[PDB]
Each structure stands twice: as C-alpha cells, then as structure tokens.
PDB file of C-alpha atoms in Angstrom:
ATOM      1  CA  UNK A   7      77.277 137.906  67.338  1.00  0.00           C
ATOM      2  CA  UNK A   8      74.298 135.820  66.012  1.00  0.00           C
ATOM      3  CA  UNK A   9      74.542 136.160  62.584  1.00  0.00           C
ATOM      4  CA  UNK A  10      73.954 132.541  60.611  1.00  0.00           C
ATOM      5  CA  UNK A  11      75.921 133.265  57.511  1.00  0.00           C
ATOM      6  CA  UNK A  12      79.493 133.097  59.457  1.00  0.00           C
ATOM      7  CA  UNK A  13      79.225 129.844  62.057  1.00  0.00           C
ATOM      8  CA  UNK A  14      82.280 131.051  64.309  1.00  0.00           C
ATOM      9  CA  UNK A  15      80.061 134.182  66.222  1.00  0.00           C
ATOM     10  CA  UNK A  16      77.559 132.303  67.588  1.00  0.00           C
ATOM     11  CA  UNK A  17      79.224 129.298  69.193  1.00  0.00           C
ATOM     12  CA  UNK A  18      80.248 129.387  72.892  1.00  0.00           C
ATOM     13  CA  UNK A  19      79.515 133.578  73.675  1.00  0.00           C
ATOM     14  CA  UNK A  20      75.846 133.568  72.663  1.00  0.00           C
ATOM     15  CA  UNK A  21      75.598 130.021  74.117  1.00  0.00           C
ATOM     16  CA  UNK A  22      76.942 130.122  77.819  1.00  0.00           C
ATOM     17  CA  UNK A  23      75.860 133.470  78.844  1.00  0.00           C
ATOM     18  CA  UNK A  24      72.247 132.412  79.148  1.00  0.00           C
ATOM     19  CA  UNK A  25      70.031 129.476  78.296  1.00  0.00           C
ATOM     20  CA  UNK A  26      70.725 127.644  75.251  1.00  0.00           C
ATOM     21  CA  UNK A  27      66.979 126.969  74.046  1.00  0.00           C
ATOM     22  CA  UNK A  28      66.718 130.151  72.688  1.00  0.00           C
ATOM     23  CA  UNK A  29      69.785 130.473  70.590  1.00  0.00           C
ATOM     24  CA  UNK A  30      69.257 126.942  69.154  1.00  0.00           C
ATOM     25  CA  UNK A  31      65.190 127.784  68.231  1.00  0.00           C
ATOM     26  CA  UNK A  32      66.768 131.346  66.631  1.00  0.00           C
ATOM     27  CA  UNK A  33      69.392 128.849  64.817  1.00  0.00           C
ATOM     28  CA  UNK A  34      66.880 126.255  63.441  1.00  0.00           C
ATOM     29  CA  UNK A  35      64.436 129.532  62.675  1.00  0.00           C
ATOM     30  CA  UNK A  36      67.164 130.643  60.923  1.00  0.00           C
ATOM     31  CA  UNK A  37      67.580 128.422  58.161  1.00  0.00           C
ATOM     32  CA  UNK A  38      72.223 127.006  58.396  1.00  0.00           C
ATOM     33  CA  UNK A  39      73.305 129.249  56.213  1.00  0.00           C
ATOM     34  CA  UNK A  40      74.005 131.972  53.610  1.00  0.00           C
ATOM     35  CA  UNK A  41      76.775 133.192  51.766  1.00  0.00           C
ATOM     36  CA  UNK A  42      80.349 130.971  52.804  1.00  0.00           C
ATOM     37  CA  UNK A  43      82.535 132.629  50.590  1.00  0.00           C
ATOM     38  CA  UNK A  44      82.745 135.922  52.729  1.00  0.00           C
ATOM     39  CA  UNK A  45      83.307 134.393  55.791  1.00  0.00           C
ATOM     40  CA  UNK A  46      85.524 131.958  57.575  1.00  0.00           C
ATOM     41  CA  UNK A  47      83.673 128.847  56.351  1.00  0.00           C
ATOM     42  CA  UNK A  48      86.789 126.809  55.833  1.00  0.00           C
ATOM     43  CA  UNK A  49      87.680 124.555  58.647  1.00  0.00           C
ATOM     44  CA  UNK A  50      84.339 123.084  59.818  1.00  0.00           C
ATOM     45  CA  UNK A  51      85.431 121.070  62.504  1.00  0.00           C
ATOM     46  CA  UNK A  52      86.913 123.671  64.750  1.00  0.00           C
ATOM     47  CA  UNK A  53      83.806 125.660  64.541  1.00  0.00           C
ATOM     48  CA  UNK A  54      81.471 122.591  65.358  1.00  0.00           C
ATOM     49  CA  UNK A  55      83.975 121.703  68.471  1.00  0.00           C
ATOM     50  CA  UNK A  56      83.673 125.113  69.725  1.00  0.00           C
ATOM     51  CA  UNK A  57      80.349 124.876  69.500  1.00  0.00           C
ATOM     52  CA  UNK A  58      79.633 121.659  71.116  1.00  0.00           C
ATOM     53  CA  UNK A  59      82.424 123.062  73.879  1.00  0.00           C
ATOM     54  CA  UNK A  60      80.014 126.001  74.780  1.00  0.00           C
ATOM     55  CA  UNK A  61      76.837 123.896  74.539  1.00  0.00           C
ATOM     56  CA  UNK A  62      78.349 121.310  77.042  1.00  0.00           C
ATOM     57  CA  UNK A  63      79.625 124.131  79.354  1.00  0.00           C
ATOM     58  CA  UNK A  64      76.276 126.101  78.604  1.00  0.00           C
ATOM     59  CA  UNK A  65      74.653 122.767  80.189  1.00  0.00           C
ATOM     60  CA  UNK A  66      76.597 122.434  82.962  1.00  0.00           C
ATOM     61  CA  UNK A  67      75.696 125.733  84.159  1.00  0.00           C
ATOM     62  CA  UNK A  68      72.034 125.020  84.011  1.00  0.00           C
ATOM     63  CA  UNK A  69      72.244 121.544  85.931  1.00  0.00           C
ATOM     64  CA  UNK A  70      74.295 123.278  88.312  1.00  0.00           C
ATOM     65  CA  UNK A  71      71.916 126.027  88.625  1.00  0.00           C
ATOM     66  CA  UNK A  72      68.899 124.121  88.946  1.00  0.00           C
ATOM     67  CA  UNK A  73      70.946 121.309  91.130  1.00  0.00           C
ATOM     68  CA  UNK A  74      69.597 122.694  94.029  1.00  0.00           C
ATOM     69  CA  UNK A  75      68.251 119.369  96.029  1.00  0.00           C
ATOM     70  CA  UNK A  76      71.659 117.436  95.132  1.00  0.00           C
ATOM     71  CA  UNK A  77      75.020 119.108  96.446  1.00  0.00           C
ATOM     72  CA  UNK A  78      76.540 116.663  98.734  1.00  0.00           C
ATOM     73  CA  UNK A  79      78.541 113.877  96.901  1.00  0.00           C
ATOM     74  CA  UNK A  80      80.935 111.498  97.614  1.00  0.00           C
ATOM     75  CA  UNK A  81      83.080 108.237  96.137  1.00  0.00           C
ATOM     76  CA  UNK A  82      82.184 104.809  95.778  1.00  0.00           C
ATOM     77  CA  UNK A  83      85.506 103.011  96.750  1.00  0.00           C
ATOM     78  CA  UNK A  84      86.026 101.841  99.987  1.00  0.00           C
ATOM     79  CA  UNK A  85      89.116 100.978 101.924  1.00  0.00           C
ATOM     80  CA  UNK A  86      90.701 103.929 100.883  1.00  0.00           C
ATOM     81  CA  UNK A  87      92.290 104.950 104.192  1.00  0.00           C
ATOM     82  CA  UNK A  88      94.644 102.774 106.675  1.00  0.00           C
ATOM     83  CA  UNK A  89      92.390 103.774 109.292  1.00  0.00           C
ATOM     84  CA  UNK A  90      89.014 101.384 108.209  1.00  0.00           C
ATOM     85  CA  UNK A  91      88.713  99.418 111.186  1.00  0.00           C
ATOM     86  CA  UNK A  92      84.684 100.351 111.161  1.00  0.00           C
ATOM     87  CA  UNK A  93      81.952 100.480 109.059  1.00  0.00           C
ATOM     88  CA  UNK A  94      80.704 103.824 108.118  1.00  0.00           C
ATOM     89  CA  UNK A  95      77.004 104.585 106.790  1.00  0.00           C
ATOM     90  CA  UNK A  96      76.067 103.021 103.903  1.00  0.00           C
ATOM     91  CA  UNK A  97      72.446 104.903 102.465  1.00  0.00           C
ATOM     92  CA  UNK A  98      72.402 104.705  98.794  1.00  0.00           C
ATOM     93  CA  UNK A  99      73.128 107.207  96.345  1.00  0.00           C
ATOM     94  CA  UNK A 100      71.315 109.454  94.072  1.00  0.00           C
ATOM     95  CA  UNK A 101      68.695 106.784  92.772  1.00  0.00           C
ATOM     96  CA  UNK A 102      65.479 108.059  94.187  1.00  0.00           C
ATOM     97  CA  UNK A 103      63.126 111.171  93.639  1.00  0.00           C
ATOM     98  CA  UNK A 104      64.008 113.517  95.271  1.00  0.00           C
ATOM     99  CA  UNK A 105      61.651 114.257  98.887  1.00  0.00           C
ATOM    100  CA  UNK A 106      63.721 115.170 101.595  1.00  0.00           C
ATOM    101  CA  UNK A 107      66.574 117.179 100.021  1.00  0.00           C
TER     102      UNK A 107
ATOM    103  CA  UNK B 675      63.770  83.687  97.900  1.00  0.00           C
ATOM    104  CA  UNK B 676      61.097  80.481  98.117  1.00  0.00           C
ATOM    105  CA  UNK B 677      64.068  77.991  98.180  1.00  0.00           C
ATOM    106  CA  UNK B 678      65.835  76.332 100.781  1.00  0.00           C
ATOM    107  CA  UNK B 679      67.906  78.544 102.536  1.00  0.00           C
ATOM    108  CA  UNK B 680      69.555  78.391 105.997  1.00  0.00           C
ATOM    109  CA  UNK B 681      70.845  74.596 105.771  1.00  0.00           C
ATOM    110  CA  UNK B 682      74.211  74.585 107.002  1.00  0.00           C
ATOM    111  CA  UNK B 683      73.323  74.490 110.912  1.00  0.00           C
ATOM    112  CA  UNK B 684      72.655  71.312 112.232  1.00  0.00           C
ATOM    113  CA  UNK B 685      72.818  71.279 115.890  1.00  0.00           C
ATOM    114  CA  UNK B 686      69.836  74.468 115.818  1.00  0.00           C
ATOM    115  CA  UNK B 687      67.569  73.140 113.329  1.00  0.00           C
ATOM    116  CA  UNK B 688      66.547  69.826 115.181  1.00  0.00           C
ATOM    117  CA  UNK B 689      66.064  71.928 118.678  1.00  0.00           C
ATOM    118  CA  UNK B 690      63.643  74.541 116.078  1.00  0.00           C
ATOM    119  CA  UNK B 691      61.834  71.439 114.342  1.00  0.00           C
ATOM    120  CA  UNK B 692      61.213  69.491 117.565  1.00  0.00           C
ATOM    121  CA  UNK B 693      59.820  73.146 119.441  1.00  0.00           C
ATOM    122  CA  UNK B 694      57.821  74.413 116.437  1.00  0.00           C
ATOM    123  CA  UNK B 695      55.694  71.855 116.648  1.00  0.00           C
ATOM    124  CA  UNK B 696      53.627  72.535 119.538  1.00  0.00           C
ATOM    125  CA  UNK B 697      50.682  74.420 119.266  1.00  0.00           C
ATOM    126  CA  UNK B 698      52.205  76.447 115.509  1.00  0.00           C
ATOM    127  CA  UNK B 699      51.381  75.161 112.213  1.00  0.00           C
ATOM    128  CA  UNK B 700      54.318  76.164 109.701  1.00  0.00           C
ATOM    129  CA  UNK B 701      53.387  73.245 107.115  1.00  0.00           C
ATOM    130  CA  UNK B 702      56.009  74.649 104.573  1.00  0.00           C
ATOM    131  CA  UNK B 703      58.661  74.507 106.821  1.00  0.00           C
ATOM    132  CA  UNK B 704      57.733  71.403 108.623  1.00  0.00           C
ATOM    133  CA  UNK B 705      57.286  69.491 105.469  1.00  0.00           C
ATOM    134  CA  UNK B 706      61.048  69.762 104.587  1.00  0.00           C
ATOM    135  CA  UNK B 707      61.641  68.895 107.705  1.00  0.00           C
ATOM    136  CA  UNK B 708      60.218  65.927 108.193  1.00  0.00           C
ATOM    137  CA  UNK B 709      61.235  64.567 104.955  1.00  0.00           C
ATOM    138  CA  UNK B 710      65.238  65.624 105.297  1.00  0.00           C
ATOM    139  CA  UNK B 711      64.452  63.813 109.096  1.00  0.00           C
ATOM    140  CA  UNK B 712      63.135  60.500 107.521  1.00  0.00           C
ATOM    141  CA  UNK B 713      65.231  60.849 105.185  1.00  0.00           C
ATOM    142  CA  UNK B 714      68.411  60.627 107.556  1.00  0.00           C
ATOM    143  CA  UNK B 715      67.039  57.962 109.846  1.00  0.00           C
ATOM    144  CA  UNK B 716      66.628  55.937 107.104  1.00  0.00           C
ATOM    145  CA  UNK B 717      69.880  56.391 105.956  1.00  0.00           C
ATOM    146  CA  UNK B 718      70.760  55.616 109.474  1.00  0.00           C
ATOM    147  CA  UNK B 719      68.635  52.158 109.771  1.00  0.00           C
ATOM    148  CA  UNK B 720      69.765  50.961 106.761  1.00  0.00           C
ATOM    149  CA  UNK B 721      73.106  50.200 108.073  1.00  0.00           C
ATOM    150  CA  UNK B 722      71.573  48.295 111.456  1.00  0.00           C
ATOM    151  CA  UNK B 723      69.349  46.310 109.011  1.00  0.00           C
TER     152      UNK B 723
ATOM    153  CA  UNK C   7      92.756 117.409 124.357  1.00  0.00           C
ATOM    154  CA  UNK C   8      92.671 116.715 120.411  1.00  0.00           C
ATOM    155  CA  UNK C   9      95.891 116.105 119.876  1.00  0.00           C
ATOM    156  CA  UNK C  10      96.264 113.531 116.763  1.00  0.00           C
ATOM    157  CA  UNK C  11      99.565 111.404 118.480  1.00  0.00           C
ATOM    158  CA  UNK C  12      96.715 109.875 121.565  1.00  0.00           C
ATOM    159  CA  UNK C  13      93.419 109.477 119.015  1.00  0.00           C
ATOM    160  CA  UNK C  14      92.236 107.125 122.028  1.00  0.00           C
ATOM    161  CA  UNK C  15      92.080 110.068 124.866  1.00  0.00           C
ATOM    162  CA  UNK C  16      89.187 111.974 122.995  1.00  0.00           C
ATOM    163  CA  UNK C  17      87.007 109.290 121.761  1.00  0.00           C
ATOM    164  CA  UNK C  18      85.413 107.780 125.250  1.00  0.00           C
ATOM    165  CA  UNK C  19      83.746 110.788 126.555  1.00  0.00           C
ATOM    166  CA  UNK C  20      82.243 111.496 123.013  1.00  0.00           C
ATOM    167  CA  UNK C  21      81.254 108.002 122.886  1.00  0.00           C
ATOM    168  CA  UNK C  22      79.896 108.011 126.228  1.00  0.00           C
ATOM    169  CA  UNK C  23      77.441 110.728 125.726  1.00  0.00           C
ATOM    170  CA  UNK C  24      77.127 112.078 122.247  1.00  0.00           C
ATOM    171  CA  UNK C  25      75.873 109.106 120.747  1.00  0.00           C
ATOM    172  CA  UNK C  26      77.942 107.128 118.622  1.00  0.00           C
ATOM    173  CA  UNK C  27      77.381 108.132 115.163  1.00  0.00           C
ATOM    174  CA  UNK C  28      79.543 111.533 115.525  1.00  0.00           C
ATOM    175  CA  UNK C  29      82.760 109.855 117.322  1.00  0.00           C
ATOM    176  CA  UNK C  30      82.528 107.495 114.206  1.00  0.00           C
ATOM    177  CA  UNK C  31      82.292 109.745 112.260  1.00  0.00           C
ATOM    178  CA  UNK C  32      85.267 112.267 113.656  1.00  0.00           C
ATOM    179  CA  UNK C  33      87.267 109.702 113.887  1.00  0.00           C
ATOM    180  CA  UNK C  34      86.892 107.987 110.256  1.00  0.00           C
ATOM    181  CA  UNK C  35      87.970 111.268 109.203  1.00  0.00           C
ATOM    182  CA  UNK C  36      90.806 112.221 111.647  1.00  0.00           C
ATOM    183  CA  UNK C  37      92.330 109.057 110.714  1.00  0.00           C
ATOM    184  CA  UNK C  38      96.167 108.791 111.003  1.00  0.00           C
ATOM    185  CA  UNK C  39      97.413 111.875 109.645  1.00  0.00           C
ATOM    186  CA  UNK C  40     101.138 111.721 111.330  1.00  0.00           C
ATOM    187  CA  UNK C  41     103.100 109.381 110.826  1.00  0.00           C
ATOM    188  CA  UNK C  42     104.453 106.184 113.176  1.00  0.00           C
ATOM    189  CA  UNK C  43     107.675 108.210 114.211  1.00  0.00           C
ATOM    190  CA  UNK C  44     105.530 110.777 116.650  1.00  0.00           C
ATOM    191  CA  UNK C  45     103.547 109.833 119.483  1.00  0.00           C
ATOM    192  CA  UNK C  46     103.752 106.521 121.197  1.00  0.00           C
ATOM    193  CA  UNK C  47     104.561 103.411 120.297  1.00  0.00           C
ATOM    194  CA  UNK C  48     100.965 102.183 121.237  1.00  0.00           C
ATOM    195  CA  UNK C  49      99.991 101.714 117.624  1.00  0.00           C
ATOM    196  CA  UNK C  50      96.127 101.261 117.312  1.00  0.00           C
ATOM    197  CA  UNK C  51      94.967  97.955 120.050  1.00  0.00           C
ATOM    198  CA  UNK C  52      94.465 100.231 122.605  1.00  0.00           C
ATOM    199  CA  UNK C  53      92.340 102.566 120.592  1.00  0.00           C
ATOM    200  CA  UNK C  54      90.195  99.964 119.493  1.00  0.00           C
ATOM    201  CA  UNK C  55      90.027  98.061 123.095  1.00  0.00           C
ATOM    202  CA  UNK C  56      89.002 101.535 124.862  1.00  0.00           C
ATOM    203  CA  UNK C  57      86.505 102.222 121.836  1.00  0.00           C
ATOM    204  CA  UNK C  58      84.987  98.768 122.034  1.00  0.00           C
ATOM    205  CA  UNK C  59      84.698  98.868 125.702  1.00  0.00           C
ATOM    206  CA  UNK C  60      82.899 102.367 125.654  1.00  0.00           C
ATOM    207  CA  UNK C  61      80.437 101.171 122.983  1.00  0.00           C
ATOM    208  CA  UNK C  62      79.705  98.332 125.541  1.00  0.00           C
ATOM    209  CA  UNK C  63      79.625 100.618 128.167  1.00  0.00           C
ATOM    210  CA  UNK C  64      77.123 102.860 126.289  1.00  0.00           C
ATOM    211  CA  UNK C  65      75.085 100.035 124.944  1.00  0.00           C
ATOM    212  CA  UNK C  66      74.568  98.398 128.341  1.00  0.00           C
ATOM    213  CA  UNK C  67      73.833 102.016 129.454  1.00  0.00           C
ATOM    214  CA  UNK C  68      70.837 102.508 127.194  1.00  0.00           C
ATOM    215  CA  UNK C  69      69.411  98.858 127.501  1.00  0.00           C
ATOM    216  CA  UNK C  70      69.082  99.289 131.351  1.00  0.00           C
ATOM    217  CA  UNK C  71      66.939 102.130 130.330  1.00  0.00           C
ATOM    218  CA  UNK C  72      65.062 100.612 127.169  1.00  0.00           C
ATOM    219  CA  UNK C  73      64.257  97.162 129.581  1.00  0.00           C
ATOM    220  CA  UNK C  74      62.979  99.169 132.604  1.00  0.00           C
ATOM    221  CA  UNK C  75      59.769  99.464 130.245  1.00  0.00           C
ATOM    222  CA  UNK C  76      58.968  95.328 130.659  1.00  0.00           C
ATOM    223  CA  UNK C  77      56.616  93.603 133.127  1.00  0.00           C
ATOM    224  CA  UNK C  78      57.455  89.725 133.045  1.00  0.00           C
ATOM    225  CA  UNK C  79      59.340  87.438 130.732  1.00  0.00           C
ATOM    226  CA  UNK C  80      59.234  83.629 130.888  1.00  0.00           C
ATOM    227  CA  UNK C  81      62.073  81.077 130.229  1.00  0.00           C
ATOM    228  CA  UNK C  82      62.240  78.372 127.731  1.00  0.00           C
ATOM    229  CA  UNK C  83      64.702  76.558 129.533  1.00  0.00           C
ATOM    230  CA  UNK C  84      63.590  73.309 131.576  1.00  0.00           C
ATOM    231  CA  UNK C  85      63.621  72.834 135.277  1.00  0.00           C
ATOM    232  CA  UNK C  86      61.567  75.958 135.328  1.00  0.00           C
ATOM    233  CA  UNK C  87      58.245  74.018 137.271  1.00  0.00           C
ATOM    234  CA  UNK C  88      57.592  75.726 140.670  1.00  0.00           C
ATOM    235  CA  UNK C  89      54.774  73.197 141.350  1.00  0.00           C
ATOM    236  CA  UNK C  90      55.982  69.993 139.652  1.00  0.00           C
ATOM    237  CA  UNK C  91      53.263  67.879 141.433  1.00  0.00           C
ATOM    238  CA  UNK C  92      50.534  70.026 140.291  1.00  0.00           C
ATOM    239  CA  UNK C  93      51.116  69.903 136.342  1.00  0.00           C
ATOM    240  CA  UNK C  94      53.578  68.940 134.122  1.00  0.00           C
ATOM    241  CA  UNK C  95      55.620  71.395 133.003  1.00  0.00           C
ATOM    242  CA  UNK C  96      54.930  72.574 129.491  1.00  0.00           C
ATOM    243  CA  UNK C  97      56.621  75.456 126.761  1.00  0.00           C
ATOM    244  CA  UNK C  98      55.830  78.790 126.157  1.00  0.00           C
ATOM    245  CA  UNK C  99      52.702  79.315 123.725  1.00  0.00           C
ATOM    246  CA  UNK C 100      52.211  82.901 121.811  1.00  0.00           C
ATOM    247  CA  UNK C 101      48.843  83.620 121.464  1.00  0.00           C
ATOM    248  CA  UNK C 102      48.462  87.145 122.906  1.00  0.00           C
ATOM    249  CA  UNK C 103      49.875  90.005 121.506  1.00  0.00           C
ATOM    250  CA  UNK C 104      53.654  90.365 121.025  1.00  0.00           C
ATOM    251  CA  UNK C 105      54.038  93.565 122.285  1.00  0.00           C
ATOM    252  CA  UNK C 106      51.601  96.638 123.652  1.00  0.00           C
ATOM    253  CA  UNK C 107      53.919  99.729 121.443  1.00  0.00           C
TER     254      UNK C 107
END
C-alpha cells in the first residue's frame, strides 16, 4: 500500500497509522509517479482530498499525542448562564510557555 | 500611561494636593497641580475684577 | 442537604470555612437547573443576601486575624493633639519603613 505509480494506496492508511514524516520523505524519495494508464489516475481531486483528509487526521493524532501539558479547555463567551450574578476567575488562556502544566 | 489620568474627582484632589505637600516632593504631579489651581482662581478673580 | 429547589441552605457553611473560591465555584456550576415551578417562590434575593452576608462574615473573620499582627497606627484626622500646649499639632510623615514583612 505504498506504491507511487497508483496515488489512491497511499493516502489516509499509510498516513494515520503512524507518523507522517516518513511516508512523505519515502514519497518525495520516490520521485510522483510512473505509469497512469494502469491505474486509477483519472479523477485527481478525490485522491488529493483523501489525502489531505488523512494528513489532517494523521496531525491531529500527533498534537493530541504530544498535547500532554494542555488538556483543560474552556469557552470564551461569558454570560452564558441565567445564573451570572458573580465573577468567576479570569487567568488567561493558552498564550504562554508552558512551566507549570 | 504618562498622561493625565484620574481628573474627574474634584472634591479628593484638592484634600491630596494641599497634604502632599509637606515634607514629599512629587514635582510631576504637583506641577499640574498648581497650574490647573492658578489656573481656576484666575478664572475665579477675573469675574471680582 | 443539596437539594437544587433551596441553593441558599448549602452555600453558608461552605463559605464559612472552605474558603470562598470552591462555593463559587459549585455554585456557578449548579446554577438553576429546575425550573421556577418547583421549590419556593423565594427566587434568588435571599440567596444573594445570605451569600453576601457570609462573605462579610468570613472577611471580617480573617481580618481580625490578619490585624492582630500590628503594633500602632496613627490618624490623619485633626483634633488628634493630646498635648495641644506643648506643640502644634502636625501630619503624619513616612520616613521609616512601610512595613517589617
């Protein structure tokens, strides 16, 4: 499922399983590729949407992964409930290195 | 922020510029102070002249 | 005990003792899940009067602790001369330190 002459195999199952560094310096390696007419080369788009699909989700998994000092979030609107007769804590949100968590 | 802030009291800011002038030296403070002061008494005089 | 329809029974103690960050906190998100039509009629005044009045209560509590730490304190007001024939009264002048901690 990594074969560069047909651009459907390696899009999203060789892309989310592990890290995605590795297929893309195989891909570049690997020249784009070889013979279309054997192959389902017809309908480019789908293929590169795929692909960007599993690179995206393939992403998400590794800043979730490596998330590991940032799992607490909340929203940014206020007055959201009837009950906001106080003030609650203000802080600030994810705009500083990260030291204590 | 170096400009004028803190203006709209009036009844405070004569009590603080006639009791921070005792043994404190605040000249940047004191220097508006004294001018918006002579300022207003001579806006004041000029009527009774 | 925590019963939603009376948010104003178990609010004081917690006030009282645990701080005040966690009642604020519990009850920010305990908010008014029910609707009017249960409970009482009492709305939310007396709920904020008894939560107001045990935040007093607490703050007063702590300052009697925090000022037993002072030695002397002078007034700016006038008529404040115990010997007004020795010398004329005059204003309080900080040169020492402002504080020892």
């Amino acid at each position: 499922s990594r074969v560069v002459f047909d651009p459907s195999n390696p899009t999203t199952f060789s892309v989310e399983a592990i890290a995605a560094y590795t297929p893309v310096a195989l891909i570049r390696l690997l020249n784009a590729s070889g013979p279309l007419q054997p192959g389902h080369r017809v309908d480019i788009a789908d293929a590169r949407s795929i692909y960007t699909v599993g690179a995206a989700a393939s992403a998400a998994r590794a800043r979730a992964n490596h998330n590991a000092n940032t799992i607490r979030r909340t929203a940014m609107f206020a007055e959201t409930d009837p009950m906001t007769w106080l003030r609650p804590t203000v802080g600030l949100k994810r705009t500083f290195n990260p030291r204590i968590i | 922020s170096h400009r004028v802030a803190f203006v709209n009291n009036f009844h405070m800011l004569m009590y603080i510029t006639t009791y921070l002038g005792n043994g404190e030296l605040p000249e940047v403070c004191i220097n508006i102070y004294r001018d918006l002061l002579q300022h207003v008494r001579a806006l004041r005089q000029t009527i009774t002249d």
